[model samples]
Target: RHPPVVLVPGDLGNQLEAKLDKPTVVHYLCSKKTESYFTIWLNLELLLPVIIDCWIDNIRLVYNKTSRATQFPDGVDVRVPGFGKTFSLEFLDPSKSSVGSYFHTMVESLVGWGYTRGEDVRGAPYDWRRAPNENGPYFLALREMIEEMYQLYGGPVVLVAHSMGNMYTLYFLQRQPQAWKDKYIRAFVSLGAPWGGVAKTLRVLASGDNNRIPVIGPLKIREQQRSAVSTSWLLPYNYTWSPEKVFVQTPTINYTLRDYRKFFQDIGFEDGWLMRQDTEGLVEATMPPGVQLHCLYGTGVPTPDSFYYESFPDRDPKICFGDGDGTVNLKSALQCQAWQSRQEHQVLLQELPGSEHIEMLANATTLAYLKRVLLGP
Candidate 1:
């Protein structure tokens, strides 16, 4: 029998609900610590109003400036403690998919294959909003959990990481010894892993919007309120943009951070830049040793190659355009060549023609590929 699979979700993949009786950060800043009043208008009933509310605050921050220490205390602490909790929204209704369920279909399929949730397959839901490195306690707990599971199942386990989940997984792997991996990890499967940092992340940090969901819109916020805990800024510097590295271009010009910084201070992101620069050294110093690795990514869609300011003359021009899985660009998602070379085993790469970041978890093609990788010869 195959080892149990540990499913890790990407950014916002884990359902983070209001842990407080009343809405907390989302409502206070967005609603006064309760669900925002704009749910009905935004069409995000199942998700928290804070999701869009934060973006609204973030966008407002980009164009406007206020007293960092006083203007918005609640929003500043959004990345801090006592705001929210992570949950598997799927188990709420096992008979069907729940609105915020991250890997509903994949979990159901695994269950159908005779694996029990607690006994075989398990969901490692986490605070997706926090910085990857800041969750050291969670990683320690994960290591202990994996050890316990290995002893119970009598075999090493498989780790299935999606999006930012891959970064967390990589961080955990770098901390452990090769013997620990050999004993505890059967294999590592990275779906849409952003081995290199993502360019869209840069745009979001500066402008305060992902542009993936229309509901969030392009709302800007105070520059100081930009949370360092956001894992987006923590992605590898190799995937980020610079004066020399031009991953994006338009008909008449090329997009560079230097050009945008002329008007947008968020682009420089003093804190985020320092955070990335500091973390880059650590990541490079502690590269994960070669292990059984399988990489799966998406393509054939217009990814965030460059921020097309001209496309929307009326707006701030925060839109990103290029080839990607609709969230992560193709190069960022597939930029695991360096990571692969360090592995003892040849790292395998699979490209899904029309896969998306969120849909990839439930898509038939991706599921089929997962089945082969996990349960095949």
Candidate 2:
């Protein structure tokens, strides 16, 4: 039989497994202590070896070290620690991904993306490392892992990333050494990531003290023009006239409006969700070359805004995505840098209309698609 599938979780990391051929499901969770209620539930579910536990709070951090190590086919090691080990996991960072970061990653994720810090909504602090330039720290990390893998088997790999994990996956794959792309990455899959940062992320940045607007949100102008479809309330602010509203109002990044709008229009923002940026050529300058990037996201499941919309300008909100999961809009799912025909790679956009990010763990449809795209067997 083929090797067991490796599941990598974003934010706080967790690892678990189930037979690919069975009705089995493994929840690789990364709920950090600082995460929200939803995040708490997400992390706890990863403890189950049987299936993704639907019951919330059934899982809890253990006082004893329970993390176990799994050896990859390539010999790289991955670990999923139990309760006691979870705390120590916070300090370990090897580069691209971390086995120690199952849950801590989640907490950092919430704070990093501005999800649940009492909604100051503006003036968020800056990332200290600044290690993540255009190339991004995660991208650099993944590159190291790939190099390690090549040193072992010298072959391609089927890469899978969940949530923001895709950010690292794409940053590395889209701009790797030609040999690496040609022979290392067989295929890549990104789940539930806001390739450019989610809209909600932008909203948070717009409100914060350390507001850092990632590429996706401000690029909305591109989409507004392309689609010729404009919605005022859809986004928290105006990317066209005032993309810097987030930063300016929040006092995070030192940017002028003239520069801000120019930046917004530059990225391939075809709508509020689908946007791209060059990160001031820093990314392209550092990127290697010849890698493929693919985007996958959950949609049309069920969400809070299902019935929320405005009646102004003759348009109706009605819960923007009446059937989407708690996070991510459908269009945002397929959106990415590679999507801009000129970028690179054979970018594919697939929308799974009825899966919830959580439910997606065991959903047959999700599994089948992942199995085909990730394993191809």
Candidate 3:
């Protein structure tokens, strides 16, 4: 009846569960002290039960400099509960809080249009704790999963990816044979895509993101966020940005994409530069997805263009603003336009002005556009 759809989620969009088989504990009261498996990620309770301190320790990944492998901590065993399933991606918090309903609106919209979970509509949620380089197994599985969906529906599959998920999908799409994509993939729908990456990705390294939880302290989460290779993967890209472009301007120095080495060194994280090296070249500037693409993103909102800091690492910086979805800059979000000339497949660029980045997940207009693209409303 319609092209089958698969939803790939952005950073922290999937729910993570941790099994505590640890010989040692970070906190004396870690949600069971010695648990089997618990939702370490949103606890859904978000109980600042003072457990966030413990949650951060378990959820963080360890990036190895020598082998470049990102591994979970020795005592911590973490896994993404659902893959090729909708519930985990649907609500990052199993409790289904409105604040944590990630793909809820989009999934419900699909249901109204005759899509079935794990059938015509599917999800590809994985351990986003690591970067693409450390995710070969999961990426390989995604190909099989897409092929499964294609077979189940007897039509090419449509991919709807959000934020950093799109970048990971970009890498997977290119690895496949071009003809394989033409046969199995119907369209690639990008939602709030930071195709050239974003400054916030860089920002997370210097000062962590609260991730929308007001109770959680940014600095408390900063160290863990800085440790993940995935964080470095989403930094403003070198391909789309020039060496002259400054991302951070402090009283004494300015940092450009070219200055990432010095920037990481200055920030006391050499592993960041190593992570950047492994992840940056995975997506070349001109390499198209080699399939039909619907470039849908938000606009007409003020986004941080650059930051001015009187000091090296200020909690608050004087922001010079620009146009975007209040997240990815316009040039970064519109990077899909570059594919129009480079690829033979159809590339449709649609902008929903006034829609924020995360807001695009639940935007009514976005849902309508998704329906029209997927099922021909």
Residue-wise C-alpha lDDT for candidate 1, range 1-377, written one tens digit per residue: 76777877766555433311223444445444333322211124332445555433432212112312112233322222211122252332223345445576787777777778666777676666555545667787778778877888888888888888887787788778888998899888888877666666645554556245554444432232244345334443543334566533444555454443332232455544444433454444236545688888888877766565543222444455777787777766665666666768667878888888777888888878777776777
What is the TM-score of each predicted model, taking all chains together? 0.74, 0.44, 0.95
Best by lDDT: 3
Off by over 4 Å in 1: 18-99, 210-217, 220-225, 231-236, 239-243, 247-269, 310-314, 318-320
Clash counts for all predictions: 26, 47, 0
- RMSD to the hidden true structure, all candidates: 6.1, 17.6, 1.8
Ranking by TM-score: 3, 1, 2
TM-score, candidate 3, is 0.95
Compared with the true structure, all predictions reach lDDT values of 0.58, 0.36, 0.82
Kindly indicate the candidate among 2 and 3 with the higher lDDT. Answer: 3
Best by TM-score: 3
Error at 332, model 3, angstroms: 0.8
For residues 1-377, write the lDDT of model 2, one tens digit per residue. 12111233443333321111112222444222221222222233332333323211222111111221111212111223321122322323323244334334333432443323212111111111111232244355445555454454445554556654454445555566566577666556566754323343322212211112232222222221222111111232222223443222211233233333432333223222222221222223223224455566677665432222132111222223333455554434544543546545676666777777655544566556755553345
TM match of model 2 to true structure: 0.44
